[PDB]
Amino acid sequence: NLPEHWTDMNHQLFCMVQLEPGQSEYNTIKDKFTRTCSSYAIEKIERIQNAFLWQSYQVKKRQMDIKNDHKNNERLLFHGTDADSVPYVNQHGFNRSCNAVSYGKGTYFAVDASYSAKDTYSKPDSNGRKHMYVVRVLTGVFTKGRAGLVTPPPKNPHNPTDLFDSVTNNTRSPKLFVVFFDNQAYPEYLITFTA
């Protein structure tokens, strides 16, 4: 069930599709970035078409929609990456096993592109190019994180296996989310940009 807005892949399961500047999809993703990163230069935006990652992600979304009995489990977040990690992420998504993990040992995602645009996260390559993903994240029901978590905390210490879906720095006004499982995050767009 590959999304409508995807383009034909000639029976292949993986493609990076450069977006056309000035068309709807490009303008949408550009505005989300320029909200907080209007001083950077965008070189290009690519749609990640990974059928395996998409399928595993959609299975987790349908499971979380059943478990939570509601369907607002998804958010659009940012993830800065060094050039050398881009091929891995395009292919295999985000891997907690691969900076400071103050809110737990998972994969980190920023509400604001400004945060992901830090050189510690979006490390400039030899040519000055920085890389940031726009990511669909199953944040689901969340609580405040803490150092050393390997999974989100229990929703009630009387059932230690019924878990929050993610953790955050701040539950009232979140600026980051940590997920602790593979296939809880779909890398949807890659932005290549410069300072």
Distance of alpha carbon 111 from alpha carbon 130, whole angstroms? 18
Residues 66-105 that bind ligand IAO (CB under 6 A): 78-80, 99
User: Measured from the CB of residue 2, what is the shortest distance to a copy of itself in angstroms?
Assistant: 13
Among 49, 116, 183, 184, binds ligand IAO (CB under 6 A): 116
Q: Give 13 or 195: the residue with its C-beta nearer to a copy of itself.
A: 13
User: Measured from the CB of residue 161, what is the shortest distance to a copy of itself in angstroms?
Assistant: 4
Distance of alpha carbon 26 from alpha carbon 28, whole angstroms? 6
The site partner of 108 among ligand IAO, a copy of itself, none (C-beta below 5 to 8 Å per kind) is ligand IAO
Q: Give 37 or 89: the residue with its C-beta nearer to a copy of itself.
A: 89
User: Measured from the CB of residue 56, what is the shortest distance to a copy of itself in angstroms?
Assistant: 6
3-state SS class at 91: helix
Tell me: does residue 176 bind ligand IAO (CB under 6 A): yes
3-state SS class at 84: helix
Tell me: does residue 10 bind ligand IAO (CB under 6 A): no
DSSP for 164-185 reads -SEEES-SSS-SEEEE-STTSE
Q: Which spans of this chain sit near a copy of itself (rule: CB under 8 A)?
A: 13, 52, 55-56, 59-60, 63, 66-67, 87-88, 90-92, 95-98, 105, 150-151, 160-161, 163, 180-183
Question: Which positions ≥6 away from 104 have C-beta within 8 Å?
Answer: 145, 146, 147, 148, 149, 150, 152, 167, 178, 180
Using CA of residue 69, residue 50, residue 135, residue 2, what is the dihedral sign?
negative
The site partner of 126 among a copy of itself, ligand IAO, none (C-beta below 5 to 8 Å per kind) is none
- Using alpha carbons only, what angle is made at residue 178 by residues 117 and 33, rounded to the nearest 5 degrees? 30
User: Measured from the CB of residue 132, what is the shortest distance to ligand IAO in angstroms?
Assistant: 7
User: Measured from the CB of residue 130, what is the shortest distance to ligand IAO in angstroms?
Assistant: 11
Distance of alpha carbon 5 from alpha carbon 13, whole angstroms? 15
Tell me: does residue 189 bind ligand IAO (CB under 6 A): no
Strands (E), 30-106: 41-50, 74-81
